[model samples]
Target chain A: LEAVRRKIRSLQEQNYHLENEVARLKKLVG
Target chain B: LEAVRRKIRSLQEQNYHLENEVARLKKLVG
Candidate 1:
């Protein structure tokens, strides 16, 4: 359904953003 | 030490946003 697709999309987007953001910061501190 | 704590805090904040954002959106579609 549309709702399920939206959920999947949101999760993917969130994961993608968070991974990049965290990695960016981590590189600075390490 | 300071860097590790910062990372923990950032992760928590990011997690909060994702949970809240997803929940708000999911409610509208379901």
Candidate 2:
């Protein structure tokens, strides 16, 4: 269970980074 | 174990979508 939680958190962190990148790109494109 | 697999898969799918979006945005910005 702890391993699963860590994996989930890692994915969430990646998602956060992607989201930030998306926002930055959007601003640039706009 | 199955539940953990599904959760991981779900996160992977989200990652895939985000990756695609990033590619699209990169193209647009370029």
Candidate 3:
């Protein structure tokens, strides 16, 4: 239970970072 | 989620329009 929640949080954080990275790459490449 | 569901569509579509706009500081002292 708690572990699943932690995993979800971790995944959410990862998704946020990915989104941010995409934005950064877009800037650099564009 | 290939995510490609179709955002930028493709790399070529990017620089396809509005040349001096992406982050275009072309209007700057450059």
Candidate 4:
């Protein structure tokens, strides 16, 4: 299940990045 | 494998959001 673990971590990282971008974009565009 | 299936779906949703964020960030900063 190493692949599964890696995928989980990768997705979590992307989720973190997306959350920051959403905050930034709202500040910018809203 | 229900847990794995759910994990995949969750990741897909997060990935979708991240892709949108990436697009918006590029538009904002690049």
Clashing pairs in 1: none
**In model 4, which regions exceed 4 Å deviation?**
B1-4, B21-30
Ranking by lDDT: 2, 4, 1, 3
- Report the Cα lDDT for candidate 1: 0.54
Q: How much lDDT does each candidate structure score?
A: 0.54, 0.78, 0.42, 0.74
Question: What CA RMSD would candidate 3 show?
Answer: 11.8
Residue B12 of candidate 3: its Cα lDDT? 25
Q: Is candidate 2 or candidate 4 better by DockQ?
A: 2
Off by over 4 Å in 1: A1-30
Please compute DockQ, using alpha carbons, for every candidate against the native two-chain complex: 0.03, 0.56, 0.04, 0.38
Please list the residue runs of candidate 2 whose C-alpha ends up more than 4 Å from where it truly belongs after superposition: B1-7
Looking at model 2, residue B25 earns an lDDT score of 73
- In terms of lDDT, the poorest run of 10 residues in model 3 chain A is A1-10
Q: Candidate 4 DockQ score?
A: 0.38
* Model 4 interface CAPRI class: acceptable
Query: Which lDDT tens digits does candidate 4 get at residues B1-30?
Result: 556557867986888877786786777665
lDDT of 2 by residue, A1-30 (tens): 778777767887887688888888788778
Clashing pairs in 4: none
TM-score of chain A of each: 0.68, 0.64, 0.71, 0.71
Q: How close is candidate 4 to the true structure, as a TM-score?
A: 0.62
- Clashing residue pairs for model 3: none
Tens digit of per-residue lDDT, candidate 3, span B1-30: 223313223322332332323334334322
